[PDB]
Write a protein that holds these residues in place. Structure first.
Motif, PDB file in Angstrom:
ATOM      1  N   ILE A  56       0.871  -1.161   0.000  1.00  0.00           N
ATOM      2  CA  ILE A  56       0.000   0.000   0.000  1.00  0.00           C
ATOM      3  C   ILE A  56       0.914   1.218   0.000  1.00  0.00           C
ATOM      4  O   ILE A  56       1.914   1.243   0.724  1.00  0.00           O
ATOM      5  CB  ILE A  56      -1.029  -0.039   1.154  1.00  0.00           C
ATOM      6  N   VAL A  65      -3.341   0.295  -3.451  1.00  0.00           N
ATOM      7  CA  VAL A  65      -2.967  -1.073  -3.112  1.00  0.00           C
ATOM      8  C   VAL A  65      -2.541  -1.763  -4.406  1.00  0.00           C
ATOM      9  O   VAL A  65      -3.306  -1.801  -5.363  1.00  0.00           O
ATOM     10  CB  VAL A  65      -4.095  -1.834  -2.412  1.00  0.00           C
ATOM     11  N   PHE A 172       1.368  -4.923   2.408  1.00  0.00           N
ATOM     12  CA  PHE A 172      -0.058  -5.059   2.450  1.00  0.00           C
ATOM     13  C   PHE A 172      -0.463  -6.316   1.727  1.00  0.00           C
ATOM     14  O   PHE A 172      -1.105  -6.289   0.704  1.00  0.00           O
ATOM     15  CB  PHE A 172      -0.736  -3.791   1.905  1.00  0.00           C
TER      16      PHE A 172
END
Ligand code: Q3T
Ligand code: ZN
Length: 257
Positions: A56, A65, A172
């Motif tokens: 991210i 993202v 992420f």
């Protein structure tokens, strides 16, 4: 640099990116009464079961993202599209208050935010090549209204304090973008462009009719992001949306009656 401010915002972008005044710019207002139902349009195929999120990132204009796009793991097909489009990233556009933030509008209505899931056509091999083609990208656009929380957004919300300023990124992994999708895949579609520089006219837009609901607390966390880098004067990342551009006789088609 370009940005969203008085001196560098959307009304300035044409100087560095003359295609800003082109024939197929995005976003647009979707006039629901004029959009024609097209019974030849296929259901949209969204295959995100094997999606691999990576990072991210605060890029100074949104947060994104990013996904592994080195294989056909998270792909968009069908609908108005020919062939297969790989998910590269998603990001959002939002407002300073709930009555603006979306890029597309519906009968002039602005939503609080708009989610873009950006995919590129595998027949061009990489996104940089795809951006140079009129059918290079497919962007799935989803409106956000404020009401009940979206549980599948919370994992995103909760890491935004770690990417406050331009530059910053975080791991992420294992984020499932299926949790951001509304029930219905009914959509409008039209040929358009990227809505940020370079404004390339390479996008088949697929805008879902059904918004998702997010909570006020979730969108408030978007509004705590910063456009600026760390150490620079703090400027809240809000109103990072381009306004509706001229339709220029393009046809918006509806998948639904
Ligand atoms: N609103 S938008 O046009 O989806 C923004 C993006 B995504 B990446 B690259 B991909 B292309 B340029 B960079 B972010 B800007 C354009 B597209
Ligand atoms: Zn976007």
């Amino acid at each position: 640099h370009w940005g969203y401010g008085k001196h560098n915002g959307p009304e300035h972008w044409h100087k560095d990116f003359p295609i800003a005044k082109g024939e197929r710019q995005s976003p647009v207002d979707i006039d629901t009464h004029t959009a024609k139902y097209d019974p030849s349009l296929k259901p949209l195929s969204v295959s995100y079961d094997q999606a691999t999120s990576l990072r991210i990132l605060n890029n100074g204009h949104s947060f994104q993202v990013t996904f592994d796009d080195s294989q056909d793991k998270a792909v968009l097909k069908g609908g108005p599209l020919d062939g297969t489009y790989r998910l590269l990233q998603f990001h959002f556009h939002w407002g300073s208050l709930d009555g603006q933030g979306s890029e597309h509008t519906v009968d002039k209505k602005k939503y609080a935010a708009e989610l873009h899931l950006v995919h590129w056509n595998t027949k061009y091999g990489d996104v940089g090549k795809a951006v140079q083609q009129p059918d290079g990208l497919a962007v799935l656009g989803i409106f956000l209204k404020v009401g009940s929380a979206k549980p599948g957004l919370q994992k995103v919300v909760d890491v935004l304090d770690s990417i406050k300023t331009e530059g910053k990124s975080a791991d992420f992994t294992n984020f499932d973008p299926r949790g951001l999708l509304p029930e219905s895949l009914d959509y409008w579609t039209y040929p358009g462009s990227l809505t940020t520089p370079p404004l390339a006219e390479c996008v088949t837009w697929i805008v879902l009719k059904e918004p998702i609901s997010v909570s006020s607390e979730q969108v408030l966390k978007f509004r705590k992001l910063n456009f600026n880098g760390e150490g620079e004067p703090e400027e809240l990342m809000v109103d990072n949306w381009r306004p509706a551009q001229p339709l220029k006789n393009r046809q918006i088609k509806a998948s639904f009656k």
